[PDB]
């Protein structure tokens, strides 16, 4: 069931390096921002922008991957994606301003449920300490 | 007018439409064209989603609009 | 009250409002400062998520309070 998405991911998958266009984040925040949205084929859309915007960061991104976050039904958790939703929300950020300061703050204004993970890992990275 | 329908895979339609034209009339094409039943499709503007009954005027959608079709929730 | 709204994004926006104001209310003075419709921003204190209706002071939100704000994706 070769689907189409495949053959979509593989030419902005060459765009990766390309010169940033609009149809990265056109097309792979929506599957991914849009409401809900397949989240496995997400998630490594997911990476894609950070490896990509790697250097230069926004809030729409984090703010539209913050809303998938809490749709979350932690009934999904069967399949494999955490570990790279997780990575995501770290690699992202690596400090400019209390920036992920405050998304830890947001975590624990929503309770605090397995989000540990994220918690800790995320609480680890932040500030200056890689050299 | 002329206005455009960008799919979530990279294909563009093109259909000719007008400014009283309802939501609900555009879809009814989009599935005379494709094979997406209305009950399953979610047209986009500017990031504003657009509501069946209402018209291509109630959103300020002019000519050559690149419409983004969102599936909502597809089922598979 | 003057109370603060931190967005999530980066930016604090200072609302004279008081502790019967309902949060339905502060979402439509937002609205008219910026331009993030009302069923578009996901207000969050200490405690958790405000819902409308509800006023301030179902949550003791007093003075100098920062609202953590979550909009729905680009308002426009």
């Not at chain 1, 998304?103 to 624990?108: A, G, K, M």
């Not at chain 1, 918690?119 to 890689?130: D, F, N, Q, R, W």
């Not at chain 2, 989009?30 to 009954?53: S, V």
Request: net charge negative; aromatic share 4%; charged share 20%.
């Amino acid at each position: 069931d070769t689907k189409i998405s495949s053959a979509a991911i593989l030419g902005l998958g060459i765009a990766f390096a390309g010169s940033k266009n609009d149809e990265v984040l056109g097309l792979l925040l929506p599957i991914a921002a849009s409401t809900d949205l397949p989240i496995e084929t997400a998630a490594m859309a997911s990476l894609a922008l950070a490896h990509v915007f790697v250097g230069t960061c926004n809030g729409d991104i984090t703010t539209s991957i913050m809303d998938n976050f809490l749709e979350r039904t932690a009934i999904e958790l069967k399949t494999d994606w955490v570990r790279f939703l997780a990575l995501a929300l770290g690699i992202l950020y690596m400090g400019q301003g209390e920036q992920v300061d405050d998304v830890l703050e947001t975590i624990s204004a929503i309770e605090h449920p397995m989000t540990s993970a994220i918690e800790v890992l995320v609480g680890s990275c932040a500030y200056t300490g890689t050299g | 007018m002329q206005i455009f329908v960008k799919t979530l895979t990279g294909k563009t339609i093109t259909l000719e439409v007008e400014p009283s034209d309802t939501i609900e009339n555009v879809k009814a094409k989009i599935q005379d064209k494709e094979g997406i039943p209305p009950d399953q499709q979610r047209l986009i503007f500017a990031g504003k989603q657009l509501e069946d009954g209402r018209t291509l005027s109630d959103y300020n959608i002019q000519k050559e609009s690149t419409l983004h079709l969102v599936l909502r929730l597809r089922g598979g």
